[PDB]
Each structure stands twice: as structure tokens, then as C-alpha cells.
RNA sequence: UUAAGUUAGAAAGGGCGCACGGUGGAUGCCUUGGCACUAGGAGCCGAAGAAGGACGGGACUAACACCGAUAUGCUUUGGG
């Protein structure tokens, strides 16, 4: 969370994209019954929310 | 033996009493909820989009509660 604040906005924006790609893949593996560590999904969702919160704070 | 006479007993089923069960949810005890007030506070919300909703959000989610595509939560300050 503080580590996110060390990054630039553009750098944060890139981290979001990466997390959204990850979240999509998790949901895809979950659907095909190949996930196992199902707790990752919640982690990633929160992370994305954290990014978007920091960015909105910047403005 | 015959005759005359007398009287018993009987239960297909039923009645009364008793015993033991079933059904049913009265009664007692209990209280998650109510009822009436007192003292203080507060007496408005809305185009900066209200009241009230609909549909969604969880690993799996039918319902409730919570939340809004940042969705079963995000940041921060304190408490613990």
C-alpha cells in the first residue's frame, strides 16, 4: 500500500493492467476447474482496488 | 328311568371401574419481542441526484445482512 505510493501514476496504471490480466486468468482457471489456490482471487481484487484508490488520491 | 318343579352358567358384542399407551397442545416456568413513559439530545432529506427500489458483488451462494463493476469491501487516523 505504501509501496504503491512509491510508484508513479503511469507505473501504477501498468500494475493494474497486470493485475486485471491475472484476475482474468484466475477466473478462467476457476471456471475450468484448475485453480486450487482459490484465495488468490480475493487478494488480486483487493490489490486492484488499492491501486485505483491511490491513483484517485493523487488527484 | 319317567314326570313335575326349581336354579345355575353363558358374551357376538356392549356398559361401569381400573391400569397402560397414543393423539393433541392447554397449563406452569422461561424470553429473543412488545407496551407506556421519564430525562437529555435531535427535529429534515433532495439536481453535489433524495425517500424508496431493481440488479449485481463471496472459492462454491438459494435467502438474510453488508457492500456497488474499487462491490462479502479500498485509503487514512485513532482504539484494541
UniProtKB/Swiss-Prot annotation:
The keyword Secreted appears for this protein: no
GO cellular-component term (any): cytosolic large ribosomal subunit
Pfam families attached to this UniProt entry: Ribosomal_L29
BP GO annotations: translation
CDD domains registered for this protein in UniProt: Ribosomal_L29_HIP (cd00427)
Keywords: Ribonucleoprotein, Ribosomal protein
Domain of life: Bacteria
UniProt-recorded Gene Ontology molecular function terms: structural constituent of ribosome
Cysteine disulfide links: none
Family: Belongs to the universal ribosomal protein uL29 family.
Entry protein name: Large ribosomal subunit protein uL29
Source organism of the structure: Listeria monocytogenes serovar 1/2a (strain ATCC BAA-679 / EGD-e)
